[PDB]
């Protein structure tokens, strides 16, 4: 019960579904995530297995600089608060649709959440 | 690098209470020590822990209905993706403020926040 809130979105052209998480710190990518889109060359592992600091994710029609902590996981990609706040976000419930930069897109339905 | 979590001010049968905005959790909770200290733990469809079906809660000026698990937790309150939904919420983070059933309340600042 409860569908959880997810977007779609596209890294490198891959497409993703990420999870939106308001309560999670930072956001994060998964390793495998990070090697099928090829991050895994950028990741910077000044010490979680690494950071990734300024890809371009890409939301709808506009590329945004996310920061993603890697860490082995289910989870392909949690967008997190600090990266929700930094583009200045609002997760709409009530229009079930996320308006996060310039741009805004929808909430995946029950089906299409992974 | 840090970023202070969400959190608004509500009342629970008329105690002040720091509330946690949480979409990345599935059940809204109340922690074993408010319901104890509210009085809510008697309604606790059931080591005083269950399940309150409904509990008026007031935001602002407005009260309305949500349900809580209680668990033994620090976090008093933690509002979950279930109440968001059920009062068609807006986590407006461009305003830093939250707009849920028919009002619109603002997230405290670092200072205000629950240590």
Redesign the interface.
Known sequence: ??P??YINIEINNYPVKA???????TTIMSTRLAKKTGLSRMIDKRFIIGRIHQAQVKIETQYIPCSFTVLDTDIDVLIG??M??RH????????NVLRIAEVETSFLSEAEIP
Do not use: P
């Open positions: 019960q409860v959880m809130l999870f939106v998480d308001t309560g999670a710190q608060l600090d929700l706040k200045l976000a609002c997760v709409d419930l009530k229009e």
